[PDB]
Ligand binder design. Structure first.
Ligand code: RVN
Ligand code: RVN
Ligand code: CL
Lengths: 148, 148
Protein backbone atom coordinates (compact mmCIF):
# COMPACT_ATOMS: atom_id res chain seq x y z
CA UNK A 1 0.00 0.00 0.00
CA UNK A 2 1.73 3.09 -1.46
CA UNK A 3 1.06 5.77 1.25
CA UNK A 4 2.85 3.83 4.03
CA UNK A 5 6.00 2.70 2.17
CA UNK A 6 9.38 4.10 3.20
CA UNK A 7 12.96 3.29 2.15
CA UNK A 8 16.00 3.46 4.40
CA UNK A 9 19.21 4.86 2.93
CA UNK A 10 22.65 5.33 4.47
CA UNK A 11 25.32 7.64 3.03
CA UNK A 12 28.66 9.04 4.32
CA UNK A 13 30.09 12.56 4.76
CA UNK A 14 32.92 14.11 6.85
CA UNK A 15 33.72 10.71 8.38
CA UNK A 16 30.14 10.47 9.64
CA UNK A 17 26.98 8.64 8.60
CA UNK A 18 23.78 10.29 7.35
CA UNK A 19 20.78 8.02 7.87
CA UNK A 20 17.88 8.80 5.53
CA UNK A 21 14.26 7.66 5.31
CA UNK A 22 12.52 8.35 2.00
CA UNK A 23 8.77 8.26 1.52
CA UNK A 24 8.84 6.46 -1.81
CA UNK A 25 5.67 7.86 -3.41
CA UNK A 26 6.46 11.54 -2.60
CA UNK A 27 10.26 11.84 -2.38
CA UNK A 28 9.83 13.39 1.11
CA UNK A 29 12.77 12.70 3.43
CA UNK A 30 13.75 12.58 7.07
CA UNK A 31 17.44 12.38 8.00
CA UNK A 32 19.84 12.31 10.93
CA UNK A 33 23.61 12.31 11.46
CA UNK A 34 25.08 9.41 13.51
CA UNK A 35 28.67 8.35 14.23
CA UNK A 36 28.09 5.02 12.48
CA UNK A 37 25.18 2.82 11.40
CA UNK A 38 24.21 0.44 14.18
CA UNK A 39 21.03 -1.54 14.82
CA UNK A 40 20.48 0.66 17.89
CA UNK A 41 20.62 3.95 15.94
CA UNK A 42 18.52 2.52 13.11
CA UNK A 43 15.89 1.22 15.56
CA UNK A 44 15.64 4.60 17.32
CA UNK A 45 15.39 6.47 14.00
CA UNK A 46 12.50 4.24 12.85
CA UNK A 47 10.67 4.73 16.15
CA UNK A 48 10.96 8.51 15.69
CA UNK A 49 9.77 8.27 12.09
CA UNK A 50 6.78 6.03 12.91
CA UNK A 51 5.55 8.36 15.69
CA UNK A 52 5.43 11.17 13.13
CA UNK A 53 4.10 9.51 9.91
CA UNK A 54 1.96 6.39 9.36
CA UNK A 55 4.79 4.02 8.50
CA UNK A 56 3.43 0.69 7.26
CA UNK A 57 6.40 -0.81 5.44
CA UNK A 58 10.12 -0.10 5.55
CA UNK A 59 12.57 -1.35 2.96
CA UNK A 60 15.73 -1.67 5.02
CA UNK A 61 19.01 -0.42 3.57
CA UNK A 62 21.13 -3.53 4.13
CA UNK A 63 21.16 -7.05 5.54
CA UNK A 64 22.70 -6.09 8.87
CA UNK A 65 19.77 -3.80 9.71
CA UNK A 66 17.36 -6.36 8.23
CA UNK A 67 18.80 -8.98 10.60
CA UNK A 68 19.29 -6.75 13.67
CA UNK A 69 17.14 -7.94 16.59
CA UNK A 70 16.98 -4.34 17.86
CA UNK A 71 15.64 -3.15 14.47
CA UNK A 72 13.16 -6.05 14.49
CA UNK A 73 12.07 -5.09 18.02
CA UNK A 74 11.44 -1.47 16.93
CA UNK A 75 9.52 -2.59 13.85
CA UNK A 76 7.38 -4.90 15.98
CA UNK A 77 6.83 -2.17 18.57
CA UNK A 78 5.83 0.47 15.99
CA UNK A 79 3.74 -1.87 13.77
CA UNK A 80 6.11 -1.68 10.81
CA UNK A 81 6.50 -4.49 8.27
CA UNK A 82 10.23 -4.84 7.74
CA UNK A 83 11.21 -5.77 4.17
CA UNK A 84 14.43 -6.03 2.17
CA UNK A 85 15.44 -3.10 -0.05
CA UNK A 86 16.41 -5.19 -3.07
CA UNK A 87 15.76 -3.22 -6.27
CA UNK A 88 13.63 -5.76 -8.18
CA UNK A 89 12.78 -2.63 -10.11
CA UNK A 90 16.42 -1.62 -10.83
CA UNK A 91 15.51 2.12 -10.91
CA UNK A 92 15.98 2.20 -7.13
CA UNK A 93 19.76 1.83 -7.02
CA UNK A 94 19.86 4.85 -9.33
CA UNK A 95 17.02 6.86 -7.76
CA UNK A 96 18.47 6.55 -4.23
CA UNK A 97 21.96 7.28 -5.60
CA UNK A 98 20.61 10.43 -7.29
CA UNK A 99 19.04 11.59 -4.02
CA UNK A 100 22.27 11.11 -2.05
CA UNK A 101 24.07 13.18 -4.70
CA UNK A 102 21.35 15.85 -4.57
CA UNK A 103 21.42 15.83 -0.75
CA UNK A 104 25.19 16.19 -0.69
CA UNK A 105 24.97 19.07 -3.16
CA UNK A 106 22.50 20.93 -0.93
CA UNK A 107 24.64 20.19 2.14
CA UNK A 108 27.65 21.75 0.37
CA UNK A 109 25.53 24.78 -0.55
CA UNK A 110 24.62 25.40 3.14
CA UNK A 111 27.71 23.95 4.79
CA UNK A 112 29.33 27.27 5.73
CA UNK A 113 26.13 28.54 7.43
CA UNK A 114 26.47 26.07 10.30
CA UNK A 115 29.32 24.82 12.44
CA UNK A 116 28.03 21.25 12.84
CA UNK A 117 27.23 18.76 10.09
CA UNK A 118 23.90 17.79 11.69
CA UNK A 119 22.65 21.38 11.29
CA UNK A 120 23.64 21.47 7.61
CA UNK A 121 21.88 18.15 7.07
CA UNK A 122 18.63 19.50 8.60
CA UNK A 123 18.91 22.62 6.41
CA UNK A 124 19.27 20.31 3.41
CA UNK A 125 16.22 18.26 4.52
CA UNK A 126 14.27 21.54 4.75
CA UNK A 127 15.35 22.67 1.27
CA UNK A 128 14.72 19.22 -0.25
CA UNK A 129 11.22 18.89 1.21
CA UNK A 130 10.16 22.47 0.28
CA UNK A 131 11.52 22.46 -3.30
CA UNK A 132 8.78 22.88 -5.91
CA UNK A 133 4.07 20.62 -5.68
CA UNK A 134 6.87 20.05 -3.14
CA UNK A 135 7.67 16.67 -1.59
CA UNK A 136 6.18 17.99 1.67
CA UNK A 137 2.94 18.85 -0.09
CA UNK A 138 2.84 15.49 -1.92
CA UNK A 139 3.25 13.32 1.20
CA UNK A 140 0.45 15.18 3.00
CA UNK A 141 -1.90 14.85 -0.01
CA UNK A 142 -1.13 11.14 -0.46
CA UNK A 143 -1.78 10.35 3.20
CA UNK A 144 -4.85 12.62 3.50
CA UNK A 145 -6.35 10.89 0.45
CA UNK A 146 -5.63 7.52 2.10
CA UNK A 147 -7.46 8.51 5.31
CA UNK A 148 -10.48 9.77 3.30
CA UNK B 1 -4.34 28.05 11.64
CA UNK B 2 -2.64 25.11 9.87
CA UNK B 3 0.85 26.57 10.48
CA UNK B 4 0.65 27.45 14.21
CA UNK B 5 2.82 25.54 16.68
CA UNK B 6 3.49 25.96 20.41
CA UNK B 7 6.77 25.20 22.16
CA UNK B 8 6.62 23.51 25.56
CA UNK B 9 9.38 22.48 27.96
CA UNK B 10 8.91 19.96 30.78
CA UNK B 11 11.29 18.04 33.11
CA UNK B 12 11.83 14.34 33.91
CA UNK B 13 14.68 12.27 35.42
CA UNK B 14 16.84 15.39 35.76
CA UNK B 15 16.50 16.00 32.01
CA UNK B 16 14.47 18.30 29.78
CA UNK B 17 11.79 17.20 27.31
CA UNK B 18 11.29 19.79 24.58
CA UNK B 19 7.87 19.58 22.91
CA UNK B 20 6.30 21.20 19.85
CA UNK B 21 2.51 21.02 19.66
CA UNK B 22 0.51 21.64 16.52
CA UNK B 23 -2.21 23.68 18.17
CA UNK B 24 -5.16 22.84 15.89
CA UNK B 25 -4.58 19.04 15.94
CA UNK B 26 -2.82 18.23 19.23
CA UNK B 27 -0.08 16.47 17.22
CA UNK B 28 3.34 16.58 18.91
CA UNK B 29 7.03 16.26 18.23
CA UNK B 30 9.45 15.90 21.15
CA UNK B 31 13.09 15.42 22.05
CA UNK B 32 15.14 14.89 25.20
CA UNK B 33 17.97 17.39 25.89
CA UNK B 34 20.28 17.91 28.89
CA UNK B 35 18.90 21.42 29.40
CA UNK B 36 16.99 24.05 27.43
CA UNK B 37 19.40 26.31 25.56
CA UNK B 38 18.88 28.63 22.60
CA UNK B 39 21.13 26.30 20.61
CA UNK B 40 19.01 23.18 21.29
CA UNK B 41 15.76 25.08 20.74
CA UNK B 42 17.03 26.50 17.42
CA UNK B 43 18.08 23.05 16.16
CA UNK B 44 14.74 21.51 17.22
CA UNK B 45 12.79 24.19 15.31
CA UNK B 46 14.92 23.67 12.19
CA UNK B 47 14.14 19.93 12.35
CA UNK B 48 10.43 20.63 12.84
CA UNK B 49 10.21 23.16 9.99
CA UNK B 50 11.89 20.80 7.50
CA UNK B 51 9.17 18.25 8.25
CA UNK B 52 5.93 20.33 8.59
CA UNK B 53 4.94 23.74 7.16
CA UNK B 54 5.66 25.79 10.28
CA UNK B 55 4.41 29.36 9.86
CA UNK B 56 4.23 30.59 13.44
CA UNK B 57 5.81 29.38 16.68
CA UNK B 58 4.67 30.52 20.11
CA UNK B 59 7.90 30.25 22.07
CA UNK B 60 7.80 28.70 25.54
CA UNK B 61 9.59 31.46 27.47
CA UNK B 62 11.33 34.82 27.18
CA UNK B 63 14.85 33.39 27.05
CA UNK B 64 14.06 31.43 23.86
CA UNK B 65 12.07 34.41 22.55
CA UNK B 66 15.15 36.61 23.04
CA UNK B 67 17.80 34.09 21.95
CA UNK B 68 19.70 35.29 18.86
CA UNK B 69 20.28 31.66 17.87
CA UNK B 70 16.53 30.95 18.03
CA UNK B 71 15.88 34.14 16.04
CA UNK B 72 18.47 33.03 13.46
CA UNK B 73 16.75 29.63 13.07
CA UNK B 74 13.32 31.24 12.76
CA UNK B 75 14.64 33.64 10.12
CA UNK B 76 16.37 30.79 8.27
CA UNK B 77 13.29 28.53 8.28
CA UNK B 78 10.73 31.30 7.55
CA UNK B 79 9.03 31.05 10.93
CA UNK B 80 7.30 33.98 12.60
CA UNK B 81 8.42 33.88 16.21
CA UNK B 82 5.77 34.97 18.73
CA UNK B 83 5.37 34.95 22.51
CA UNK B 84 3.41 32.11 24.13
CA UNK B 85 1.43 34.29 26.52
CA UNK B 86 -1.98 32.72 27.18
CA UNK B 87 -4.23 35.68 26.32
CA UNK B 88 -6.76 32.87 26.13
CA UNK B 89 -6.02 31.42 29.61
CA UNK B 90 -6.98 27.87 28.49
CA UNK B 91 -3.40 27.41 27.26
CA UNK B 92 -1.65 27.25 30.64
CA UNK B 93 -4.09 24.44 31.48
CA UNK B 94 -4.16 22.72 28.07
CA UNK B 95 -0.34 22.54 27.86
CA UNK B 96 -0.19 21.48 31.53
CA UNK B 97 -2.69 18.68 30.79
CA UNK B 98 -0.58 17.46 27.86
CA UNK B 99 2.61 17.34 29.94
CA UNK B 100 0.69 15.30 32.54
CA UNK B 101 -0.66 13.00 29.81
CA UNK B 102 2.81 12.70 28.22
CA UNK B 103 4.39 11.84 31.57
CA UNK B 104 1.71 9.24 32.20
CA UNK B 105 2.44 7.53 28.86
CA UNK B 106 6.18 7.73 29.51
CA UNK B 107 5.65 5.94 32.85
CA UNK B 108 3.53 3.30 31.10
CA UNK B 109 6.38 2.51 28.64
CA UNK B 110 9.36 3.40 30.82
CA UNK B 111 10.44 -0.18 31.59
CA UNK B 112 10.47 -1.15 27.88
CA UNK B 113 13.52 1.00 27.15
CA UNK B 114 16.81 1.70 28.89
CA UNK B 115 17.08 5.36 27.83
CA UNK B 116 14.59 8.15 28.52
CA UNK B 117 14.77 9.41 24.92
CA UNK B 118 13.41 6.06 23.67
CA UNK B 119 10.51 6.15 26.15
CA UNK B 120 9.72 9.70 25.07
CA UNK B 121 9.55 8.66 21.38
CA UNK B 122 7.29 5.72 22.32
CA UNK B 123 5.05 8.22 24.14
CA UNK B 124 5.04 10.54 21.08
CA UNK B 125 3.99 7.54 18.97
CA UNK B 126 1.18 6.56 21.35
CA UNK B 127 0.01 10.18 21.71
CA UNK B 128 -0.12 10.84 17.96
CA UNK B 129 -1.88 7.52 17.13
CA UNK B 130 -4.50 7.66 19.91
CA UNK B 131 -8.03 7.77 18.52
CA UNK B 132 -12.85 9.54 15.94
CA UNK B 133 -9.53 10.65 14.43
CA UNK B 134 -6.00 10.63 15.86
CA UNK B 135 -3.83 13.73 16.17
CA UNK B 136 -1.70 12.35 13.31
CA UNK B 137 -4.76 12.06 11.10
CA UNK B 138 -6.00 15.55 12.08
CA UNK B 139 -2.74 17.38 11.28
CA UNK B 140 -2.53 15.75 7.84
CA UNK B 141 -6.18 16.62 7.04
CA UNK B 142 -5.80 20.23 8.23
CA UNK B 143 -2.68 20.80 6.14
CA UNK B 144 -3.97 18.92 3.07
CA UNK B 145 -7.13 21.06 3.16
CA UNK B 146 -4.94 24.18 3.39
CA UNK B 147 -2.93 23.19 0.28
CA UNK B 148 -6.15 22.46 -1.67
O1 RVN C 1 14.28 -2.80 23.71
C1 RVN C 1 13.77 -1.99 22.95
N1 RVN C 1 12.52 -2.02 22.37
C2 RVN C 1 12.35 -0.96 21.48
C3 RVN C 1 11.25 -0.69 20.70
C4 RVN C 1 11.29 0.42 19.89
C5 RVN C 1 12.41 1.22 19.86
C6 RVN C 1 13.51 0.94 20.65
C7 RVN C 1 13.47 -0.17 21.46
C8 RVN C 1 14.40 -0.77 22.40
C9 RVN C 1 15.64 -0.44 22.81
C10 RVN C 1 16.41 0.70 22.32
C11 RVN C 1 16.64 0.73 20.95
C12 RVN C 1 17.36 1.75 20.36
C13 RVN C 1 17.86 2.74 21.17
C14 RVN C 1 17.65 2.72 22.52
C15 RVN C 1 16.92 1.71 23.12
C16 RVN C 1 16.71 1.71 24.59
O2 RVN C 1 16.72 0.70 25.28
O3 RVN C 1 16.53 2.97 25.07
O4 RVN C 1 18.24 3.81 23.11
C17 RVN C 1 18.57 4.58 21.96
O5 RVN C 1 18.59 3.81 20.75
O1 RVN D 1 24.17 30.00 12.70
C1 RVN D 1 23.16 29.33 12.53
N1 RVN D 1 22.10 29.56 11.68
C2 RVN D 1 21.10 28.60 11.84
C3 RVN D 1 19.91 28.53 11.17
C4 RVN D 1 19.06 27.48 11.48
C5 RVN D 1 19.42 26.55 12.43
C6 RVN D 1 20.63 26.64 13.09
C7 RVN D 1 21.48 27.68 12.78
C8 RVN D 1 22.79 28.09 13.25
C9 RVN D 1 23.66 27.57 14.15
C10 RVN D 1 23.40 26.39 14.97
C11 RVN D 1 22.29 26.48 15.79
C12 RVN D 1 21.92 25.45 16.63
C13 RVN D 1 22.69 24.31 16.64
C14 RVN D 1 23.79 24.21 15.85
C15 RVN D 1 24.18 25.22 15.00
C16 RVN D 1 25.39 24.98 14.18
O2 RVN D 1 26.16 26.08 14.11
O3 RVN D 1 25.65 23.91 13.65
O4 RVN D 1 24.40 22.98 16.02
C17 RVN D 1 23.44 22.32 16.85
O5 RVN D 1 22.45 23.19 17.40
CL1 CL E 1 1.02 9.16 13.23
Amino acid sequence: SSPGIWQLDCTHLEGKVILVAVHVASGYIEAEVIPAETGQETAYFLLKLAGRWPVKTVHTDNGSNFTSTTVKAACWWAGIKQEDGIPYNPQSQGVIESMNKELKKIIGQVRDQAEHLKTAVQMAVFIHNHKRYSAGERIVDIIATDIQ
